[PDB]
Structure formats: C-alpha cells, structure tokens
Amino acid sequence: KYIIEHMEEGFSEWVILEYSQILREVGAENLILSSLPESTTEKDIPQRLLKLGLRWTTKDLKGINEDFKDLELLKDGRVCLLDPRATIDLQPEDATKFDYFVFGGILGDHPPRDRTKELKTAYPNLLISRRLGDKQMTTDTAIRTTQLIIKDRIAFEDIKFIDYPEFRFNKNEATEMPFRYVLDKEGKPILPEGMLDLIKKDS
Amino acid sequence: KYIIEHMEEGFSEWVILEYSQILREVGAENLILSSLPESTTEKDIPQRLLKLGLRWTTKDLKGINEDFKDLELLKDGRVCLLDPRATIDLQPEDATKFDYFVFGGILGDHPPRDRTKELKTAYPNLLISRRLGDKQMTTDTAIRTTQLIIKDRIAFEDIKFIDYPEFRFNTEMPFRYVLDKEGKPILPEGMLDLIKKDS
Ligand SMILES: Nc1ncnc2c1ncn2[C@@H]1O[C@H](CSCC[C@H](N)C(=O)O)[C@@H](O)[C@H]1O
Ligand SMILES: Nc1ncnc2c1ncn2[C@@H]1O[C@H](CSCC[C@H](N)C(=O)O)[C@@H](O)[C@H]1O
C-alpha cells in the first residue's frame, strides 16, 4: 500500500528514525521502500529496519510487482502520488480509488533531483497527484496523515495539527521545526521515537 | 488498537507465526499482547516477536494504561470484545464507537479456561461484544477481518471468505479464511509448512 522512494544516499540516523516509526505504525507488509541504488544488498540496509521487517527494493514503480508476489498490479489511475504542490487534497472517499500511495521528494542538493516530477513524467497514465494540505510535512507525518484520511476516514480539516512547533532543550536552545505535525492526545506533536533526542544533539 | 490476550502457555511455533503475521499487517504500535503470566520477562518472549517490536504485558485490561502511557484511556462502551457466540455482528459504522478490540478465547484444557467469559464478567461496564460471522476464525484471520470491517469500511458479507479449506501435501482446516486476489486462503507466512510438517 505505501511506497517510499528512498530520498537520500545511504541512511542517516534521521531517516532510520522516520522509517522505523513508519514501519511500526503501518506494519512491514504495507510499506515498500523503493528505487534504492542498483547495487544495494542486505548489508546496505540498516539492521534496525531489517529487524522490523522492512521490505525494500532497487526496482522502480513499474518493476516492484516483479519483486513481490503478494503485490496486486499497478493499474492506471489507482496509484496516488503525494505532492505538496498538487491542487486537490486527498479525501476520505479516495479510499476506493487508490491501491498505492507513493512518496517522492527531492533527492540531494547541488544539483537537486526532483523525483516527484520525474515520476510524474515517467508515469503519466499511472499517477494521480494529491495534496496533504498547504504545509510541508515529514515522511512519517505525511504517512500518518494519509492513514488518518484513508483508513480512519477523517477529512483533512478535521485532523488536529500544529504548524512550526518549537522545541525547547535548555534555557539557551530554542529550535523550531518548519513542518506541520499531527497532534497526540496530550496536545503535543507526534515525532518518531528518538527524533527529539536527535534534534537535541544537533544543537 | 488491538489487544490480544495471550491464549496459550508459552509460545508454540504456531502462535509465533500467527503473532508475526499480525504484527506485520497492523504494525507493532497498534497491538498489545496482554495477560501474560506474572513471572514473564523479556527473556521469555520469542526473539522473532521482539525484533518486530511486540508490545506485551502481564497486565490485564484495567492496568494496561499503566504500562503504556501513550495509550488512550479505556472508556466504558468503547472497548469491543470479539466473541463468536455474540449476537450482534460487527459493522463498518462501528469505527466511531470503539478505541479497542479485544481478543480472548480458551486457555484449555483439562480443565479449559474461557477467558472470553472471564473478561465479559470481570469488566461488565467496559465491554461490548461483537461477532465476526457464524464460523470460527484464527486470531490472525479475526484481526484481518476486524481490519477490513473497521479500517476499509467493508461489510462482512462483502468480504470474500473460504470455509474449511483443504490442503493436500501429497488436511482440512476448520476455520473460515479471507481470500487473497489469487483466490487462495490467507495464512500467516510459514504456517503451511507447519501444517504440512505435522502430517
Ligand atoms: N503537504 C504535502 N502534501 C503531499 N505530500 C507531502 C506533503 N508534505 C510532504 N509530503 C510528502 O513527503 C515527501 C517529502 S519528505 C522527503 C524528504 C527528502 N529527504 C527530501 O529532501 O525531499 C514528499 O515527496 C511528499 O510525498
Ligand atoms: N467468528 C468469530 N467472531 C468473533 N470473534 C472470533 C470469531 N472467530 C474467532 N474469533 C476470535 O479470535 C480469537 C482467536 S481463537 C484463539 C485460540 C485459542 N487457543 C482458543 O481456543 O481460544 C478468539 O479468541 C475469538 O475470540
């Protein structure tokens, strides 16, 4: 159901924390990590994700069925590409329309590689583009949101968010995260396990 | 979130494969394995389940919040106990009604111990009982079904099942099973070998 195009070279601690959280919230059978470098083997995947059962592949969108027997084929118009630049928000009623939710992004910098657009250009008949509100989200937030709209059938504007949360570490260090986050029951922003400590040590 | 009451002594390969499948399909965040023996420690929990991030506890329903502060409080009427002898079938619109779905069963045998009744009795105000069809399901199938009804909002009679499938190896399973796209019953990874090995 959820397909993440791996958006970096190697795996930083940050992306390991995100992917870990995603895995524990959707379950390993429901996430495919795709488009990894062609040379990638098991020894290249962080063992923390392997233990959690991460399904990964070097293949791309059209080729993933070749790597997984259980995966229903990719039909035209039933694959939703998620893009903050799209004009139509994802709706609860879309639960019927899509069998796959794809996350692209921007790979690297200097130059950057807009994978979202390249996908859009590679799969003109496959992809439908949808937005998750007018603010930028992290991958685990974007997935949590997709899951809230599609599985819990809650419309976007009924979801409680916080934008640009500020985290205070000491009397000196005040950092602000330039993203929208889903609130938890106690009114605080949901981050992956370990993310907070990671942000702290960055200061 | 799903709460599974651990319904056998120790961990057989059978239940390990069943629990693994569940964890991979719903996510380890969304499952609590409860009511384990008081002596139980992490050392007694199978490694394959710990790697997948199994959340387990010796506690029962009343004390589940104590072990996991991230969980929403259990409120009366918002906890559904899944019971094949119950009267009202679980329906898609119940997705707004419940925060928890509990799976009990029989801690047999000689004598057996019906945890389903024990629960239903120890927590009368807490629990509401729902059925998943008139046939018996494995826990992984019952969770799979609860998920289709609650998360995908698919009605029970619109789910495609197979009743009492036979498996030839050169065996009939007395359960109802959900079908996959390929028309075959959906079993936990590794279960077919274990069924075969037993023959
Ligand atoms: N508001 C929004 N609407 C739709 N998708 C969004 C979104 N905010 C984030 N996303 C998803 O999350 C992804 C960005 S997270 C990508 C991080 C990567 N290291 C990079 O540099 O780009 C996007 O590809 C998109 O799929
Ligand atoms: N048709 C049905 N309707 C509602 N719940 C069901 C069901 N079939 C199975 N379940 C639930 O799924 C669980 C798995 S059966 C558990 C196995 C255990 N050895 C025992 O005999 O009890 C059961 O506890 C039951 O409560």
Closest Cα to residue B57, out of B75, B40, B82? B40
Q: Which residue of A has its CA nearest to B23?
A: A27
CA-to-CA distance for B69 and B57, rounded, in angstroms?
Answer: 13
User: Residue A156 CB: number of other CB atoms within 10 A?
Assistant: 16
How far apart are the CA of A78 and the centre of ligand 1, in A?
A: 20
Cβ–ligand 1 distance for A114 under 6 Å, the answer: no
Among the CATH numbers 3.40.1130, 3.40.50, 3.40.1280, 2.60.120, which is that of A2-155?
Answer: 3.40.1280
Three-state DSSP at B85 gives: coil
Distance of CA B99 to the CA centre of its chain: 15
Q: Which candidate in A1, A17, A22, A23 is best for mutational testing of the B interface (most B CBs within 10 A)?
A: A23
- Give the max Cα distance, chain A: 54
Q: Which of B29, B151, B181 sits opposite A24 (nearest CB)?
A: B29
> B67 vs chain A: nearest CA distance in angstroms?
17
Closest Cα to residue A145, out of A119, A96, A180? A180
C-alpha distance across the termini of chain B, in Å:
36
Ligand 1 atom index nearest CA of A103: 26
C-alpha distance across the termini of chain A, in Å:
36
Q: Compute the C-alpha angle A181/A35/A121, nearest 5°.
A: 85
CA-to-CA distance for A152 and A28, rounded, in angstroms?
Answer: 19
DSSP β-ladder status, B55-56 and A174-176: unpaired
Closest Cα to residue A2, out of A38, A35, A34, A36? A34
Test A26 with B27 for CB contact under 8 angstroms: yes
User: Residue B8 CB: number of other CB atoms within 10 A?
Assistant: 12
Please give the full DSSP string across chain A, using - where no structure is assigned.
Answer: -EEEEP-SSS--HHHHHHHHHHHHHH-GGGEEEE---TT--GGGS-HHHHHTT-EE-S--TTTGGGT-TT-----TT-EEEE-TT-SSBP-GGGGGT-SEEEE--EE-SSS-EEHHHHHHHH-TTTEEEEB--SS---HHHHHHHHHHHHTS---GGGS-EEES-EEE-SSS-EEE--SEEEB-TTS-B---TTHHHHHHHH-
Residue A177's Cβ-count burial label (10 Å; 0-12, 13-18, 19+) is: middle
CA-to-CA distance for B79 and B99, rounded, in angstroms?
Answer: 6
User: Residue A158 CB: number of other CB atoms within 10 A?
Assistant: 11
Test A152 with B95 for CB contact under 8 angstroms: yes
Closest Cα to residue B80, out of B53, B65, B61? B61
Q: Which residue of B has its CA nearest to A148?
A: B151
Q: Which of A30, A72, A185 sits opposite B72 (nearest CB)?
A: A185
Q: How many residues does chain A have?
A: 203
CA-to-CA distance for B110 and B112, rounded, in angstroms?
Answer: 5
Task: Kindly report the CATH class assigned to B2-156.
Answer: alpha beta
> A59 vs chain B: nearest CA distance in angstroms?
22
What is residue B65's DSSP assignment? Answer: H
3-state DSSP helix/strand/coil percent for chain B, to nearest 5?
Answer: 35, 20, 50
Contact A119, A81 (CB under 8 A): yes
Distance of CA B189 to the CA centre of its chain: 16
How far apart are the CA of B142 and the centre of ligand 2, in A?
A: 7
CA-to-CA distance for A42 and A59, rounded, in angstroms?
Answer: 15
Q: Which of A24, A152, A184 sits opposite B28 (nearest CB)?
A: A24
Contact B27, A27 (CB under 8 A): yes
> B153 vs chain A: nearest CA distance in angstroms?
8
User: Residue A75 CB: number of other CB atoms within 10 A?
Assistant: 12
- Torsions phi, psi of B117, nearest 5? -75, -40
Sorted by where each begins, the domain ranges of chain B are: 2-156
Residues on chain A touching B180 (C-beta within 8 angstroms): 70
| Residue that is written with structure tokens 């990894």 in the block | A36
User: Residue A99 CB: number of other CB atoms within 10 A?
Assistant: 14
